[PDB]
Symmetry: C3
Subunit: 319 residues, 3 copies
């Protein structure tokens, strides 16, 4: 079970990436001791235009910092809780084998740092999240991210890797009602989200912050679903998934339009850019995408291929 | 990736089928140019007994006309919008590689026709739907269908193929409230459908409109889910799926009772009819099936096989 | 027909059914048998939560119902016994049955009656059974569901522990944890707004004294049903990773899965090895169900700490 022995070499200080970026491959044939530091920050951010929300974050972003390790690594986790935090936080990583996936070993009061160590026994793409009572509220405020545990051979090389995470959010106000929106427990219990978002905001991955790729380039997206409650009917408008690591497992389904991502679950999708234009990540529970903000953009630039996609060729009158 | 060369032979004028029928296998060894013509029609139809609804349709049905092509085919798509239409419409086919799955290239005003061409690069079974703002409304009014992209070698032969598509519907009125029912945007945004239906109506596939097969016949169902919002726990009462193309992909799960069909997704199920009687397609989120209309019938004709299924053999007094 | 091994051989087998969370032993058999299965329906008030009661409708006195274990190709002679204290008739649809209603049509049983019907278990798998008496949603919601395992001919790979767990959504007239005898609420059920989401028919059915157990080093197989009626489980074990999932209960496996979707009226099989001692939590990771509606069950692991795998908290320090 990832039995590649005791750690070797110098301890590696993991470099974490902010969404939507992914750390490079560990490019490593031996297990290492990997030191991971992650700081909780409670901060007001823009959930929608003119709409503020008090997010609780791992590394100041929703989703939180991406962590990349190799199956068989020993991970020395340091959870820091900023002095400015109103409350304690902890971490459950779905990649941990042990109680609370770390929750029991990571209670961190404001201004404190918890250290715990775990072996990454299983390859996969694992949701991590705060596991502080009430757990649903901590998740709903943005306390989730992904940790990639590579297989020992590493993943097949691609041109672009991206980090995207859906979440459902519960404001006291309705969708696009302006001002600082409190969290709404009643709506959260009833699974009636006001917003459904990729990367913590309407337009988090639109305009200048859109994902980018070129015609001919292979694209892998690690797609997390923090929930707390919703299951994503995950689709890219104008693309087909060549490969889906369905529910984030090792085995693949091929030629998929739309894949179900469980709440507190993940998937990996892979496809090749072939036509320039705007491609739209959506929850194909489609009112979420077009009426609650579940939309992110991948812009493809490069030469037109009119043999693959012509664009509109003729308009005519019809009786 | 569907690189079988330039289209060859005679240009094909696709014969589309109305649900629940499927066009025949393309039975071709070569990539072709396939001309597809599909007319949008807005029309009042019966959604339930004494209940009407203004459906928006590709080809006059919900779901829309079934399109069948081969991986590697160049599809020349003609979207016609009937002059009677109040709204413009377009089409996003999940089988299209490029912006909006064709939405960007298919804006069609009433009494207009849009032409756009694409290559079908990926085999699979793909939802198509209108992508006109508000997109959720156009889908909710029934603007969805399936396009089958065959592998180059074709699908394994079966006795029957059926076309079935779940949708969730949002009427101002409650379930079975009589009269012409408007669309309800509030129920749609809140994912609180008044009806969940196979093929656009309560009883669309019941009685004289049931699917049919005979004892001993292999059945393939292309099972679409137009949504807009619900995920189907898709089950056939009294059958087990020998094979499921889970999420409509190439690989297969075997021996599955109930398979989750994503909103804007599809599956293929295969089983063999062994025992005569009525088999019920349901959303096994079971209040949908028995209280909101999500039920369709497959009638199996032929000889009883009491060694597989006896029927009720005995009723006895029980004191317990 | 793979799964047809001809008619029963040897002496009839009187099946022993197990109450959750226990499973019958592997059958360990090389021939098709006539397996006589007897299952009694009992309607009874039970505690759904501390100081809250509910009138459950049960197969064999438990929610979920008694676990049935047979071999692919067995002839099952089913005896459904409805206790005369029952206020409703009941029947049974087993998702492992090939034929009308999965047996529902052959097992209509008035109070104080016994129905017999016979079927061949043609498909290996892990199948939901449930009552199919109108209103079907209500019979399921009152707890009439369980699992029947149809082993492959050679049996499943040996494990240290097999457990039986089944999620249900429940609809009370009152709110979550309001005390007293809670009526079924049909309006909440139709709206898919459960007051409780539970493992094995009650808050704490699988907590404290009733927790599951294994030892460090031991392989665990959990047969996870979802009776619904309406919800899909984002099924996770806090602190564990599924080495293998039989996704949607099918024969093929996915490897290294955190959270697997279990359809309404569906099932999965998860396998993992206990490596670290402590408390592991079965949840619906639609996580407000788990921590606000009671969708929480416990697996206690006992044995030697392994600090190389999980150290526990090593240091608390103060930082700016
Ligand atoms: O087969 N069950 O609804
Ligand atoms: O890891 N479960 O919330
Ligand atoms: Cu927290
Ligand atoms: Cu979790
Ligand atoms: Cu339209
Ligand atoms: Cu779509
Ligand atoms: Cu019953």
């Amino acid at each position: 079970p990832g039995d590649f022995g005791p750690p070797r070499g110098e301890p590696i200080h993991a470099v974490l990436t902010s969404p939507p970026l992914v750390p490079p491959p560990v490019n490593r044939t031996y297990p290492a001791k990997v030191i991971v530091e992650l700081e909780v920050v409670e901060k007001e951010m823009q959930i929608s235009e003119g709409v503020s929300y008090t997010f609780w974050t791992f590394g100041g972003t929703v989703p939180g910092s991406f962590i990349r390790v190799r199956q068989g690594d020993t991970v020395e986790f340091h959870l820091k809780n900023h002095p400015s935090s109103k409350m304690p936080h902890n971490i459950d990583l779905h990649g941990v084998t042990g109680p609370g996936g770390g929750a029991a070993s990571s209670f961190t009061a404001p201004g404190h740092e918890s250290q715990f160590t775990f072996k990454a026994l299983n390859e996969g793409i694992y949701v991590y999240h705060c596991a502080t009572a009430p757990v649903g509220m901590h998740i709903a405020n943005g306390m989730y991210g992904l940790i990639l545990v590579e297989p020992p051979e590493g993943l097949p090389k691609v041109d672009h890797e991206y980090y995207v995470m859906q979440g459902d959010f519960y404001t006291a106000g309705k969708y696009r009602e302006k001002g600082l929106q409190p969290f709404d427990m009643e709506k959260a219990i009833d699974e009636r989200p006001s917003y459904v978002l990729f990367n913590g905001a309407e337009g988090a991955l639109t305009g200048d912050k859109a994902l980018h790729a070129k015609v001919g380039e292979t694209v892998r997206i690690f797609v997390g679903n923090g929930g707390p409650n919703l299951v994503s009917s995950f689709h890219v408008i104008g693309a087909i998934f060549d490969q889906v690591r369905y529910e984030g497992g090792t085995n693949v389904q091929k030629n998929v339009q739309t894949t179900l991502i469980p709440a507190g679950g993940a998937a990996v999708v892979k496809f090749t850019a072939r036509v320039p234009g705007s491609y739209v990540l959506v929850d194909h529970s489609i009112f979420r995408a077009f009426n609650k903000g579940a939309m992110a953009i991948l812009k493809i630039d490069g030469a037109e291929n009119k043999l693959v996609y012509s664009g509109k060729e003729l308009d005519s009158v019809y009786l």
